[PDB]
Each structure stands twice: as C-alpha cells, then as structure tokens.
Chains A and B, each alone.
With several copies, the nearest count.
Chain A
Amino acid sequence: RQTGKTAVALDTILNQKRWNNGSDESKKLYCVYVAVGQKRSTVAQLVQTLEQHDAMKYSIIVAATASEAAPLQYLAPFTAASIGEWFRDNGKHALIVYDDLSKQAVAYRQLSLLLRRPPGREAYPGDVFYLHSRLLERAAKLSEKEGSGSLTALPVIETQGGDVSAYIPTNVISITDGQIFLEAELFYKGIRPAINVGLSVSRVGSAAQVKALKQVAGSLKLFLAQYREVAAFAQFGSDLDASTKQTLVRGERLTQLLKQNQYSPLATEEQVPLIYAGVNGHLDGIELSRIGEFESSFLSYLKSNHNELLTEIREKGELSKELLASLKSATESFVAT
C-alpha cells in the first residue's frame, strides 16, 4: 500500500490525454477507473485531480467506495468490465484500471461467508480465482473481424509486507499478462516509481511498443536483472567488480535513469534518448548522482535545439538508420556536458 500503484495508474490516465484529445479514434484510449475499496475522500481527490488536468472528459469513475455494502464492491469491477467491453466491442480502445482488487476479493469473502458457500483455501472461497479469471480475461485485444478493439487492463493488488507468495498474489500474478512490482523499500529509498526491474515481467517484451523504445531496450530488463545479481555478487566478495564492471556501471546508471515524478506524463518521444544513452554505454562518465540532472539537461537539449530527430521519432513511431544516427550524434555531442 502507498507504493505508487494508484500513482502509476493516474499517470497513465493523464498520459492518455495526448492521444484521446485528437480525432483518430484508433489511437484514443477512453479510460475507465475502478475505485473499489477506496474511501470517498480519496476518490473525490482523484476525480478532482483528473478534471484539473482535463482528464475527466474521457475517464469513467464507475466504482464502489467503502461506504456501500460488500456486494457493491464485488460487482463494481465487473460492471466496469462491461463498460470496457462496450468500448471494445464498438471498435474503440479503452484502458481499465482495477484499482486494488483485494477489497473486491474480501467483499466476495463477505458474501460467501453468510451465503452458505464454504471457503476453499486460506479462509478464501475457491471461486476467487474463477472470478478474477472471468473479470480480467474479458480484457483483450479484439481482431479486425470483431472491430480491432482493445480493452487494456491495469489490475492493482495491495499485498502485505511485499508477500507476493500469498494466495491472492499467486492467483492474480497467474491471472495477468505480467506484473509491475512496487516494493515499499524502493519508495522509502527515494525512487518515487519504486519499481523493481528484476521481477516486473510482461508478455510484450520488445512487442506492442512504439518501436523506437523497443529497439533501444528490447532486452534491457534482463541486463538490469543481471546487473542487480552481479552487484549483489560484487558486495559478496572483493574481485573484478564494482566500478570496474562496465555491466554494473551501466545497470546502476540505467536504474537511476528509470525515475519519474507524479502528475508528470512524459511522451514517448522524450524517452528514447535517455534509454539509448543508458543502454549503449554512453553513461560511463556521468556519475550516479548527476544522472538526475543529466536527464533534464538532455531532454531540454532535444526540446530546444534538437527537435528535428525528436519530432521525427514522434511522427514515425520508430527510429530508423537515419534516426539512430541522429540520436547517436546528439548523445555523444551532449555526453561532454
């Protein structure tokens, strides 16, 4: 709890504005929020923040707060799924964020305890896995025959003490297409996204991406995980490791690179140069503490006097040989600063 799950959900919703504010319905993402098990003050603040950024025009806040009964909590995500399929079955693309399904599961527990359905495992009725299955498998990308609609889902679970091996975790990690880990220690360390690269996997590695980011960092997650393992190995014994390891240096610089402030949606165009500098070993002599300033300086460099290749990447949605060469030019011209 309070690790950034709702934070990343709202950043995604805000970032969808740049694409739903146009006219191409094939790229608009009509968001729908599921604030189940959320206090009414929190959801009021959330909708206030949404309309502050003009995000309420495309976001549905169908939800059941903690005030109403357990069946409201149990059914609100399913009706949000119904709205999501309506958007999906009509050829449109909708993003649904099932915020903190844990209260939905425990609401079903409350129903089943006094509905005379015996619990299955760990005081949880067995049908919790089935309900998660039917609710999240409704989220899918339709084929061209069915209208090519999409129903992107962002499930959220509140685990206790980082126990991803608990029951409800195990089911939902097995119900989803990859996960985004947000441990409390990383949030307390200072990394606001607080995402662990090592365990956060997905089924769209170097796929279902823009293309510019997929070529730069199509396999960077494995490299970062190996960096973490070697850094653990580096502290284990004094050997040819630590700063003498190019892999360790690149991994630490990239991990420091991967940071973000809330309410700051960054477009895809101002993301390739940073990762490209990280992956291509251009951050060996930039120092961990100075990477935070390097990000802002590099972004300002692109958005002020190198907007050519940035806009080319944005409009093309891919970095070609010309774009790769231009980005290399920019990065080793700005590496000296």
Chain B
Amino acid sequence: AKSAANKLDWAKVISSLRITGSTATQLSSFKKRNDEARRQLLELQSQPTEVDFSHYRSVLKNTSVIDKIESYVKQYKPVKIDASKQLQVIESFEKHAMTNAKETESLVSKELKDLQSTLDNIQSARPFDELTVDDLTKIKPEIDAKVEEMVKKGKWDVPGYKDRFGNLNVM
C-alpha cells in the first residue's frame, strides 16, 4: 500500500506545473517521509518484548530478578488504547476537499470548453478585411462610451492610436 502512495506522491512532486510556491505541503511530505523512516527503524530494530528465557535464563544462576522483569513485561504489553481517532478534523478537511475539488474540476472543464470554442470561432470564420464597423459596435458598446469620454474631455490624441498602425503623414 505504501509503494503506490510513494509513487503517486513523487510523481506529483516531479510533475508540479501550477502546484508551485508552496510552504506547508512539503512540510507534510517530510512529515510522512520521517514517519515512514521511523516505521522502518521500528521494524528493523524490533526488540523482544517477552524475555528469551529459553536461552537467556540458563546464563544467569543467581538471578533473583528474572521473575520480576518477566512479570513487569507481562503487565506492560497493554500500554494503553491506540488512538485511531483520525475522524474529527481530518474527515471534515477531506469532505471540503472533494466538494470544492469537484467544483474546481467543473469550472476548469467549462473554461477549457469556452477557450476551445473561442479558438474555433476565431480561426474558422469571421474574416477581418470585410468586417464592418457596425458589427463591432453591436458586438461591444464600450467603444461608444470611450468615444463619449474622449470627446467630452476633448482629447483626440490619446496615447496608443497609430503607433501599431499606419499614420501615413504625407504632408
């Protein structure tokens, strides 16, 4: 189970395109990494809870303590009840996670469809040489408002008029 999780986590880390500029998810990444390191250390360094009296008791002759330690470990194995209660704030965080994640998936999907339609009707039709000004006026009326505002203010040479076009100042 850990193998697939590590695969997906590392793939996400190396495939970050709009998932940069982070401050805490990498912190959780190192938290998980050191948690797994502690797991591995505990498995490789598993000391023997019960006393190995089969081969160790014969070593001691005047023990006077092996029974005491045996009883102490016998009464210590149930240290306490495991928490296993990651279902009060983690669950709420996750619920919000999938909810607004589906919301974002829907919005990015419809944005992609809108952009595709924009490209399609930009490049497939609408020639510009035969385009009429009335079509531009009916498509968008803010140009009319711009004309009102620079006529009333009386500035007919607002910067950015013919720099990219032809002035053709013959005289």
Is A–B contact present in the complex under a CB 8 A cutoff?
yes
Task: Please give the residue numbers on chain A whose beta carbons come within 8 Å of chain B beta carbons, in ascending order.
Answer: 304-305, 333, 336
> Which residues of B are found within 8 Å of A304, using beta-carbon distances?
6, 33, 36
- Tell me the B34-87 residues at the A interface (CB within 8 Å): 36
Min CB–CB distance B45 → chain A (angstroms): 12
Interface size class of B (residues with CB under 8 A): under 10
Contact A333 B14, beta carbon cutoff 8 Å = yes
> Which residues of B are found within 8 Å of A333, using beta-carbon distances?
14
Q: Mark B88-110, 1 if CB is under 8 A from A, else 0.
A: 00000000000000000000000
> Which residues of B are found within 8 Å of A305, using beta-carbon distances?
3, 6-7, 9-10
Task: Please give the residue numbers on chain B whose beta carbons come within 8 Å of chain A beta carbons, in ascending order.
Answer: 3, 6-7, 9-10, 14, 33, 36
Question: DSSP majority for the B interface?
Answer: helix
Number of residue pairs A-B, CB distance < 8 angstroms: 10
B33 closest partner in A (C-beta): A304
> Which residues of A are found within 8 Å of B6, using beta-carbon distances?
304-305
B9 closest partner in A (C-beta): A305
Min CB–CB distance B131 → chain A (angstroms): 48
Known: A304-B33, A305-B9; 5 extra A-B contacts, CB below 8 A, are: A304-B6, A304-B36, A305-B6, A305-B10, A333-B14
Min CB–CB distance A304 → chain B (angstroms): 6
A334 closest partner in B (C-beta): B14
A307 closest partner in B (C-beta): B3
A235–B36 Cα distance when bound, in Å, is: 47
A336 closest partner in B (C-beta): B14
> Which residues of A are found within 8 Å of B9, using beta-carbon distances?
305
> Which residues of A are found within 8 Å of B36, using beta-carbon distances?
304
> Which residues of A are found within 8 Å of B10, using beta-carbon distances?
305
